[PDB]
């Protein structure tokens, strides 16, 4: 859906989730580290957090987790199924409000 940004760098995902976002705002963008992959950037609790999405050819996951056929149902599944994302012994991550 429109939560997808193909044009944007890691820095612009920071500048948009900070100025225009609220906690729970997220977006998917191309990865600067891994080309042809995507990272989610989530504004959680004051700051921006990036999560690498893994695309293996055969599926999309978040480097572990349930496997999905397309990017779009991955975000759908995590927007709908609250609570499955815990940062390593940190807080939960909520993918709440699609950004722009």
């Amino acid at each position: 859906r429109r939560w997808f940004h193909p044009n944007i760098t890691g820095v612009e995902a920071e500048n948009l989730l900070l100025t225009r976002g609220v906690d729970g705002s997220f977006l998917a963008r191309p990865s600067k580290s891994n080309p042809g992959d995507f990272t989610l950037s989530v504004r959680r609790n004051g700051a921006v957090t990036h999560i690498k999405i893994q695309n293996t050819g055969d599926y999309y996951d978040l480097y572990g987790g349930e496997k999905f056929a397309t990017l779009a149902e991955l975000v759908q599944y995590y927007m709908e199924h609250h609570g499955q994302l815990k940062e390593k012994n940190g807080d939960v991550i909520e993918l709440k409000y699609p950004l722009n």
């Binding site: 921006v48 987790g65 815990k86």
Partner: peptide, 8 residues
């Protein structure tokens, strides 16, 4: 700016 890794 943290690249977080999730624990499932």
């Amino acid at each position: 700016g943290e690249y977080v890794n999730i624990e499932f």
